[PDB]
């Protein structure tokens, strides 16, 4: 098993990933989670993450691993009404069974006093071997850590797999002053995006849109979770993605962004990857966020994921909502 | 037990409501279902009553009953957002166990075929004692049976138990064009509305604002149906108030729960007699229900001091019914 870190910012899709990861013990060993302010509120959020890990200690062998909230700061924030959704989840009835919540309110104390951002930097160099991170929000966390530590720190990361962008496919920024170029996760935080691509000593792995639109939350797969209600982790799988399925009245839409992300992390058969110079828009355009092919001499390269195995990712949850 | 028909409109406290009614089986024997594409997608509340009923069935032994859609189109419809909760029911692993789909699978042809406004009104005429109403959606419903049929109809309703309205606090319709006094399954369609407040012969019990205000949906309560989640009814009842814990007019309180609760015991909330309009026109007040001086004008009994404590043990103890 190798060291992750998952750098998260508490939607549904990042806590589909969390438990993609802490499930897959043979494959990932989780040493630590982080909560960015972004997608949820971050108290709601980092209680969501305590929660889940509880349940999946208490019902399998997950060794607990430090919790931390983010310091970062938006640049521009999601939308009120989708960082609601880590409050909706804090008071899911699977995620607080008594003894769980319990051994949670146990060991929240050490795990409110971390910095995010430093238990980042921490958990990557402090390790022995070489610690891969998946980042399923902004860029904010791996940026800071690249602004303080520099090769000192990126030479200790195997590689970042982010969740983020949009390279040859439209973006999901849909706002009055957007022109729709631009991804979220980029959004929020261009110029931290900006920093971590542009890195020339940290490898990256980028599931931009061009293939997370391949994989909709969709109906009848979301209900094969239904066949697995024994299962406490196909309860919470199933609940969260039910929350995400397309609406009929509707005419934007959920994907399993994050969730093909962290798979890719569990086993690189899910995506195969094209080396592209990815910058990054940090004006204040119409296409702010974006993320571009640039032509800039010695300019590093970013693995962007491409024709992802939809029914192999779709499969591998499916199996991994059953360890407990 | 007495005869209970639900006529809802497939929100999450819809749902809840139709989970006290079935569970409390002592009091109550729900002897049908109605859906009106209100605050819903008709299609997605359709499949979650028949799911809710059909997991109902083989875990309590729930007599099973038709459950038909609504013709009913709206005056004034719903925001799109509120009306998408039930699709999100639809797709929930408690909803979603094989053997209780493949029930659902089974039965479904049969209630896809009633049309809803007909079914409420044979059910209730058909019946050998009389048929309380719990209505939780608008009223156009009722309001059709009573247009149709009038008093052939009306004899044989024991009492309609109404969520709707706003007496003496503000309603929920905050838009541009209105001044905030309507509610809005009222508001959904007001001309049905104004029928069933008026008709005479119709005993009304009405939840109002006035009364539901009472009781937010907050997180410490929700959390506590993670005490009892060896019951399937409390996964499914914690997932549905969990869902609405987050909002902020747009705060979400167990409006269709408390009704249908006064349903199950009217021990619920005591009630004062109301001559009850509803305004029709359009102006800012569209949909609001006023008192009227009409004379003679049939009273409708409002809800007032409900008993919170009372419906939240009710419901914590009704969703370990399974
Ligand atoms: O832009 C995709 C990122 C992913 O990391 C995932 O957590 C959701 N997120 C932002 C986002 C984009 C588009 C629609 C959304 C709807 C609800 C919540 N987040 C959304
Ligand atoms: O006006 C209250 C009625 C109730 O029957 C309940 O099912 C919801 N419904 C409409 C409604 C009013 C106010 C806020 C809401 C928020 C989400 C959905 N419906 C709402
Ligand atoms: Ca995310
Ligand atoms: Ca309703």
Redesign the interface.
């Known amino acids: 098993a190798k060291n992750v870190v998952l750098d998260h910012d508490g939607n549904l899709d990042d806590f589909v990933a969390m438990v993609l990861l802490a499930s897959n013990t043979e494959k990932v060993r989780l040493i630590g989670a982080l909560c960015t302010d972004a997608d949820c509120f971050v108290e709601n959020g980092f209680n969501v993450t305590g929660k889940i890990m509880c349940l999946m200690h208490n019902n399998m062998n997950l060794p607990l691993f430090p919790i931390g909230k983010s310091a970062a700061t938006a640049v521009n924030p999601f939308p009120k009404?989708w960082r609601?959704?880590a409050?909706?989840?804090?008071?899911?009835?699977?995620?607080?069974?008594?003894e769980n919540?319990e051994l949670w309110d146990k060991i929240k104390a050490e795990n409110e006093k971390y910095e995010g951002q430093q238990l980042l930097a921490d958990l990557v160099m402090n390790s022995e071997e070489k610690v891969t991170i998946c980042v399923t929000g902004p860029l904010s966390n791996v940026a800071w850590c690249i602004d303080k530590y520099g090769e000192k720190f990126t030479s200790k990361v195997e590689e970042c797999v982010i969740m983020g962008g949009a390279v040859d496919v439209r973006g999901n920024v849909f706002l009055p002053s957007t022109d729709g170029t631009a991804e979220w996760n980029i959004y929020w935080d261009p110029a931290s995006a900006k920093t971590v691509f542009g890195c020339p000593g940290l490898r990256r792995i980028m599931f931009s849109l061009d293939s997370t639109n391949t994989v909709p939350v969709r109906?009848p797969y979301?209900?094969r979770?239904?066949?697995?209600?024994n299962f406490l982790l196909?309860?919470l799988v199933?609940?969260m993605?039910?929350?995400c399925?397309?609406?009929?009245?509707?005419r934007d839409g959920y994907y399993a962004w994050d969730a093909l992300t962290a798979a890719y992390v569990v086993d690189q058969k899910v995506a195969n990857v094209d080396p592209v110079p990815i910058d990054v828009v940090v004006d204040k355009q119409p296409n702010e966020g974006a993320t571009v092919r640039t032509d800039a001499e010695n300019y590093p390269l970013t693995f962007v994921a491409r024709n992802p195995e939809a029914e192999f990712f779709l499969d591998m949850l499916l199996r991994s909502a059953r360890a407990c």
């Open positions: 009404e609601c959704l409050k909706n989840m804090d008071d899911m009835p699977i995620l607080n069974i008594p919540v109906s979301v209900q979770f239904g066949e697995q209600t196909s309860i199933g609940t993605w039910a929350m399925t397309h609406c009929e009245l509707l």
